[model samples]
Structure formats: C-alpha cells, structure tokens
Target: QIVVGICSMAKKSKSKPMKEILERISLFKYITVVVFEEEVILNEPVENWPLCDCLISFHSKGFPLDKAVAYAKLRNPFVINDLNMQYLIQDRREVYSILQAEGILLPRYAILNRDPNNPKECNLIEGEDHVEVNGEVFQKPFVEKPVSAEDHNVYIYYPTSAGGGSQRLFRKIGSRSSVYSPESNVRKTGSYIYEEFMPTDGTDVKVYTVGPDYAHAEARKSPALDGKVERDSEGKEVRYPVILNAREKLIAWKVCLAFKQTVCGFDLLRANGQSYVCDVNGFSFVKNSMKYYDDCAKILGNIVMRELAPQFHIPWS
Candidate 1:
C-alpha cells in the first residue's frame, strides 16, 4: 500500500479541490488515506504504516512550519506538501531575503509592533533600538502587517499567505485605522504585522505549478470596478480564467525554481503596465470559479499522477 496522509484540519470545506483529488486518487488500489484529526496526531507513531509513501498536508489554519518539518523528519514521508519549503513559502522575512537575492520585484515593506511597556509608543519600527526600532522601512503609502500567524489577513493590504481566496479588506496606504482590531480569535496570541500597501488597479494573476511544470494560469479580477483588477474584497465578484502573458510565464517558472516545490502558486499584480511577484503559496487550491472548474482539476490531476506513477505497478509485456 502507498499510504497517503492528509491533514484533515487543512481542508477548507467539503467542496475543496483537494478533497476531490483525494477521492480520485483513492480509486487506485495501492493508495490509502490517513486523516489527521488533531494537532497531537502529528507526533503519533507512523511505524505501523510502513507502506506510507507520501504525506500531503493542506493547511487552513496555519500550522507551525517548524513543527511540520520535525514531523516529516520523524515519519520519513516521501513528499511533504511544502514542508521543506516552509522558510521560503511562509516566512515573510525569509521570502524577502530570497526574492531580493534572486532579483525578484517586490513592494517595499516595514514591520510594526505595540510596545509592551509603553502603549503610547505602540507603533515602533522593526529594528531601531529606540522605544521601537524601524527596519525594512518603506515610504508613506507603503503596507504594514504583522509577522506572526495572528495577522493572517495581512493579505488584504498586500498578498502574504499561500491560500487562494478573496480578502475582506484591501485599504490604501494611510487609509487604515486602528479601529479595526485584530480578530478576537487571533488576538489571544497578541501579535500583529504592518506592511506597506501596494497599489493595484485591481486584477492579479495566480500561477499554479506542479513539480517543475507550470500547470495552469488564472486571472483574479476585482469586482468593485470593471476592467480594473482589485485584491481583497468581501462583496466583490471575483473571476478566474486561464490566461498568461510572456512576462508572467517567466515569473511563474522562476518562482517554482526559487521555492523548489512540486506544487506551488504565485500571486502577481500588474500596475502601470508592469508585473510584480506579490506572494507565493506552497499548498494552494485552485479556485473552482465558473470559468475554470474542470480545467483546474485536469491540470492538478495530471501533475499528481505524473509524479506518483513510478511508484505504482502495472502489468506490462
């Protein structure tokens, strides 16, 4: 048996494509599914399942990537979704460094935090040794966001995480107010992220890849304004369809190389006729929008099968 473990908590909903992918792959006789229920199961013994081949973890609630990596080392699974690429995929600081080294275009950003001793000096720069430090500084009209998991919606202001979906807030630089407190659930940890906001007329590209192959391309459009692509909106009617320009195609390829993961997604934005790599998602789901439902499945399925084929045995001459 080629045991495949999927972290169940990561499943977004009953209708997510990963669930469908599970159903399809299970049809093969050599495959078995292990559903991870709670956080504790990550450390559970996998010795009983010597047949386990790959572990595909789809994260909805951010799991500590470091812990996930430790689990993969203990279990010795073949493919760890994107565990090995955790530093590149999830860490904002790590990503900034990598992109800068690769010469990838990214918006300027800064980190902010509330002083524990002095609430009045709450908004301090990231590195300055004053009451607060200022590092990774960006000019006004820049984005501000938290570096921890608590501020997951930092993408509303700038694309940060690896999941695909619409954001509830996408305010302009200098437009944000402290009135919008962190989500009650997230505040228990007491962390926040501030980033420099990027200006996008509204449409952006989502490039999906499997292994070294660029699988599919889609355009996410802003619903607020026609012909203008926007990011992060609740009432916006987002549209996704397969489309790519030559420059975007190059970016997709470079991102896959930089992260060196089998499956990944890149969020790119176009402003003033130029494209920038805004964010990259390691374990991402292709949006099943009206324009690219089955096409998305076909693209992903092909990649998965191609990667898993050698492990399965078939009768031959």
Candidate 2:
C-alpha cells in the first residue's frame, strides 16, 4: 500500500468522498490516505507529517504552504499541485506574462506600478511592465482590476485621453455609481491591472485541469460582458453548459504542463474566434464540477503510486 497525504479546506460533502475513493480504490487497496486539515497543518511541522509518499496541496493560504512543502520535497518531490504552480498563478499579471511568453492569448493589459498619484513610472503589477499614467490608448473604456482577482472594486476607467485630465471610470458593472470613485493612490498602493475590455457575444469558458492533459470545460454567459450575473429567486448566480473545441482546450492545457499543476482551473474569453485566458487558479477547492472528482482523484492516486512504487530508473530520487 502507498501512503498519500491530503491537505485541504473543503466541506464534509466533498472531503468525505475524496477520502472514501482513495480508501476504496481497486488493486492492492494500494492507498493509505492521511489527511491534514488546515488546523493541523498550521499547528504542526512537516517533519511530523506522518509516514506518506506524497501530498496533495489543495489549500495554499492560512500558513506557510511553501516552507512546509519545500521541507517535504527534501524527502520526496512529488507533492501534487506543487508549490511552484500555486506561486506562479497567485499573481494574474505574472501568469499572463508566463503563458504569453509561450504564445498564450491574453487581453491587452497594462499594470499601474507607481504611486497612483504619479503615472510617469513603469511599474508592472507582478513584474516590471510599468508606464506613466497619462498614457495613450486607441481604445475607450478601460477595464481594470487587481492582479489578485479576489480584490474588490475592479473597475473601468477611461483616462480623459487629455493629459492631466480626470479619468472616466465605472465599477465592473452595476450601473455607474454615486457609490464610489477610484483612487489612483490607493490603486497604486494595491496595484491594478488595466485591460482593453474585450467585448464578447456573452459567453465565457472555464476549464479544469488535472495533471497535464485531462480537462473538463464549461461555458456560461459572462457577468462582466452581459452586465451583472442573472440569478435564481434566491440571488444565487446561475450557470450553463459549454463545449470546448481543440483550440480552446490548448488555451487552458499547455499552461498546466508548464506550471506543473496536477489540479487547477482557468477562465477564457473569445472574440473573433480567438480564445484568450482571463484568469487561472491553482488547486481550486471546489472544482469545475464534482463529476470529475473521482477521475481526478484516481489520476492523482495513480501518480502517487507510480512515484512511490519501485521502478526501473530513479534519477529524481
């Protein structure tokens, strides 16, 4: 039997099944899964991580996921959803640069790096793509957001196009506001991503990847494009189905191999038949759907078994 470690933050519904499948897998009953909850991971050291082959890193926040995983790697390097993948995708701007270098499609984006008050410096969000604020653009209505994606106040700002003139900005969409005005200083302090609001016929694609190839995709009307998400009577966001073509799959697939993400998800948008990646996530707690959970889990389990089980050659060891 092989020992696999699980570190997650999940509801009992998902977590229970996750454990059950590994415990019940066919052949050699070959997996002994040791689960490490967020509490345990934060409180205990990696050296005390129990006898296990490799770990699955599902939760990256709340503690030192890096230090812990790196320590584990000192013993065994096969941590599923590894630290490198998580770190790369944490910053939207950096990941875009990474994939863009590999020819991935991305929106026309610029990072505001200087103190929001001064726009004459070139400061990229996660890297070094900075330029002055009083800049030039051939387009109108700039869509922008924090590089982190989780931040609030992701808004739209059209610089007066006149040097030293105030910007015309709107929040992501909910009717222009008496509710807020964007602050450059605050934006500068926090770092913001400015993109050329790609107009869509109103559809977005989300693809979930396990290891390098297996992907499950879904399409939905974009709240950003369609202007606010429609919901049930209970105000929950609604969803729908979508089919990915071969090209679309590669949009989300190639990055997986480069990032070495055993489990991850990314969003895409299309215009004029070209697909562009809008966002990427590492080891999403809740996946594209639970339908693929068992298969994905099985895929990961096989990885543990393969790396742990004896083989002909072992150079990485």
Candidate 3:
C-alpha cells in the first residue's frame, strides 16, 4: 500500500485539495494518509505494515520529516520527499557554477567573508578599488545576500528572507537607499553574496517543475509603487501566466538535470529580452496554472510507482 503523509500544521482548508486528489486516484483504496500532530495512531503493527514505498513531505518543516523518514525505514522505506534530499543534491555554489558552465544566464554575484572586527560585512559592497557601505563607496548599491542556505537568515539582505516570497531587494547601481527593507531585525551571520541589480523589464517568471518537466510558468509583475514583484495596492491578486519559449524550457530542463532533482521549482527573470535563472527550490509548491497541478502530480505518481514496481522478465532456461 502507498501512504501519503502530509504536514500536520497544514490548515484543514488547505488540505482539502490533497484529500480530493487522493480520492480521485483509483488506487486510493491502497493508499493511507498520515498527518503530523502531537500524537498519531498506528492501526497495524508498524513492522507488519507494507513498506512505505514513498513518502511525500511538503512546506518548510524539515526536522519533523527527518524523524518521519526514520520511522518509515522501520518498514523498509524507499523515496522520501524532496526537502529530505537536500544534502544528496549539489551544493549552492556547485549548482550555480554548473549552470554558468552550461551558459544558463544568472545574476552577476560574488561571495564574501564576514569581518569579525568590523561586523559591517553584512552592509558592505566590494568593488575593484575599495569597499563601500551605506553612503560610502564601499556600499554603493549592489545587492548583498548569503551564499550558503544555512546562513540565509543572517546574511541575506532581502526582507522576504524573514517572511517569504519571490520578492527581491534592489538598489540602483550607485544609490544608497534600498527600495525596501525588512520589518524584522537584520542579523549578521556568516558570508554574504553581492549581486548586480538586473534592469528588469518589470516582470519575472516563476517556473514550477515536477521531475524533469517544466510544469508551468507564472509572471510576477513589478509592483506599481516600486517596480518590483509584490502584492498590488488594492490588495487584489495580480499575476500573469507566461508560456515559456523554447529557449526558456531548455534552460529549465538543464537546471533540473544539473541538480538531479526529482521535483523542483525555479524563478527566471527577463531583462533586455534575455532570460536569467535567479532562484531554485528543491521543495516548492506547484500552484494550479494552465491545468498543470494534476498533470504534474500524475507524472510524479507514475515515477514513484515505476521505481517501486519494476517489471521483471525471466529467460527461458
């Protein structure tokens, strides 16, 4: 039997869609649903139950998933969720370099080490001649962020790092003021990444992938106030559907293959009519757009089943 374990913290309303999907699949009778909670009930003896076969975890809760997969191993586990495979996939610098080698466009960026005595590394910008921060030459307008995912909270300058979203933190080439800043405290952790601000034509594309396929793309337009992607003024949702061109699709495929990711999502930006891959998510939500939700899920299910139930042939002896 195949079992689907979902995050317990997920709101009941949010889980309705997944439940509906479970019912739609003819194999639902063979499937069991496990939810995260302070406590859970196991009907059959854990060992006697069939092998987990596959475990799908969603959202950002990683520690709980580690425990879940460990428990599943008692029944001979197989594939765990995407987030659980972070260490198995390539590291950030390696992934970025691979894409660069393949000619996949990305933002111009460089990594930096924090100065223990100064403590200004979080705010400084490195230049050919000298460093700058705030108004000084050292800090004149390149975006700064963390190179390592573990240090994202401490070093990344983007406000969304504290909350969440595709929101970007940008300043003009030589401007001191940022377009925006985070409401929470900005803590300095480890290393930082300084990047050139792309002169975006006011729109960025978010591509959601399942395994090796480009499932869908959505365009996030610049906010009317600051010319960056964000919620609109009236609080009305505003996002556009973008059908990726052949070149964009090819780039997406290369990225997925490079990372060896079974399911992932990435954001691409178009500036001066050229596409640049800006971000990737090993574990990301695939929203329904152009009927991509069910299509991608079906493909994922098939992949899992194929791996779990490989066909066997016997030679005539």
Candidates 1 and 2 compared: the better one by lDDT is 2
What candidate 1 gets wrong by more than 4 Å, as runs, is 8-15, 27-34, 37-51, 62-67, 111-139, 153-197, 221-237, 240-242, 289-317
Q: For model 2, how does the per-residue alpha-carbon lDDT over 216-317 read when each residue is reduced to its tens digit? A: 777665644424456567554556677778887776578677676777778888776788887777665233345665676667766766776775243322
For candidate 2, the lDDT comes to 0.60
How do the residues 85-203 of candidate 1 rate in per-residue lDDT, one tens digit apiece?
66555556666566667777776554445555664464454221111225444433333345543233442321123221223333333323122322211121223444444567656
Q: Compose the digit string of candidate 3's lDDT tens values, residues 1-317.
A: 55555432354314544555444433533445555442331233334433345655443433344444445566444443444355433245555666787789987766555677877745554443334444244222244455554333222232332342122344322322124443322235555555555657667688866666655778866431244334456653467868999988888788666665556677787877888886666655454342565665566556555655442121211
Q: Rank the candidates by TM-score, best first.
A: 2, 3, 1
Candidate 2: where is the Cα deviation over 4 Å? 9-28, 115-138, 149-152, 158-189, 225-228, 232-236, 285-290, 311-317
TM-score of 3: 0.65
The local distance difference test score of model 1 is 0.53
Task: Enumerate clash totals for all models, in the order shown.
Answer: 24, 6, 7
